[PDB]
C-alpha cells in the first residue's frame, strides 16, 4: 500500500485536500491496487488510475470532480527528477516502472493504453527486496513533450497477482 | 543452512562426535547445499548425501569413514514421527520433502536415485515463509520396510537454486 508523493499523484492530492469531491479515495491514498502485468494485463482502459475500483472512479475522469482541470506539477523535459513513493505497508517488491502519455494524447475521455508511450522511460528492478517507508529515486523525465501530460507510475508487488496503480499530472 | 538432527543426519553424527574421522564436515554440519531439483536436477548419484561436494564425500560413502556401519536410528514403520531441523540461518523455504529407501536398495554403494523411492512420503509446502530455528513437523513414516533404510530430506531454498540435502540412516 501506497502512493506517489514526487511527482504527486491523482489519489494524494484527493487526499491532502488540494481537489475536493473524490470520495471514498481521500481516506485511503494508498489502496489503489489492481492486477500486476500492465500493460498487456491490468486495469481496463479508462480505469488505469483507478487501478479498476469503482469506489475511487474519481481518479480516471480526465478533470477533477468539479470539472475544472487537474492540478498539474511542473516538470522539465529530459531533466533529472526524484520519484518519491510513500508506503503505508512495505510489500517485498519486484519492480517500479514510469510510463508518460504521447504527444496528441485524448485529454478528454479517462486514460487508456493508447494515450500512453507503453515503453517506460524509468524502470527500477528492486529484486524483491522491501523499500524503505519512504523512496526517493532519480529517473530522467522524458524529452519532446510539452503542455498536459500523465505519468503513470506502477508499483508491482512481489509474489502477488497485484500491483498499485498512480497517475500524476504534470505539465513540461 | 541447516540439518536434520531427528531423524540424526550422517553430518550431524560427524559434527557431534558419534562417527569420525568424516573431514570438514565436522565443522559444519548445516552447509551440505547443492542445486534444487530433486530428483530430476539436483546432486549426481552417488554425490547426493554430500550435495556435490567433494570436500563432504564421506557423507556418500555406505560405511562410516573408519568401515564400519552408519549408526542408525531404531524407527517403526507406519507410525507418526517428528521430524526435525535446526538451522544456522533460516532462509525463506519453498519445502521439504523427505524420501525413503526402497526394499532391496543397494546398501554397499554410494546412495543414487535407482535406491530410492522417488515419490516423497512425507512434503510440506511451507509457502516462502521462514521457518524458526528449530522446526518440528509430523508425517507418518513409510510402510513395508523392515532393517537398514536412507531416509532423505530435502529443504528447497525459495528464490534460489539451492537445496539441503540430509541423509538419515534409520533401521526399520
Ligand atoms: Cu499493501
Ligand atoms: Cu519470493
Ligand atoms: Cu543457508
Not at 480505469?47 to 475500483?53: F, L, V
Not at 480526465?62 to 512495505?90: D, E, I, L
Amino acid at each position: 500500500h501506497g502512493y506517489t508523493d514526487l511527482p504527486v499523484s491523482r489519489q494524494k492530492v484527493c487526499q491532502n485536500g488540494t481537489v475536493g469531491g473524490c470520495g471514498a479515495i481521500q481516506w485511503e491514498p494508498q489502496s489503489v491496487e489492481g492486477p500486476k502485468g500492465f500493460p498487456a494485463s491490468g486495469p481496463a482502459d479508462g480505469t488505469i488510475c483507478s487501478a479498476g475500483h469503482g469506489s475511487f472512479a474519481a481518479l480516471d475522469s480526465p478533470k477533477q470532480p468539479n470539472g475544472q482541470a487537474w492540478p498539474t506539477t511542473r516538470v522539465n523535459g529530459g531533466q533529472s527528477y526524484t520519484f518519491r513513493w510513500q508506503f503505508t505497508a512495505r510489500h517485498a517488491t519486484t519492480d517500479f516502472k514510469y510510463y508518460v502519455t504521447k504527444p496528441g494524447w485524448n485529454q478528454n475521455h479517462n486514460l487508456a493504453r493508447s494515450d500512453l508511450n507503453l515503453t517506460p522511460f524509468f524502470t527500477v528492478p528492486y529484486g524483491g527486496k522491501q523499500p524503505p517507508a519512504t523512496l526517493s529515486h532519480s529517473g530522467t523525465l522524458p524529452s519532446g513533450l510539452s503542455g498536459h501530460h500523465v505519468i503513470l507510475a506502477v508499483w508491482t508487488v512481489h509474489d502477488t497477482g497485484n500491483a498499485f496503480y498512480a497517475c500524476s499530472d504534470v505539465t513540461f
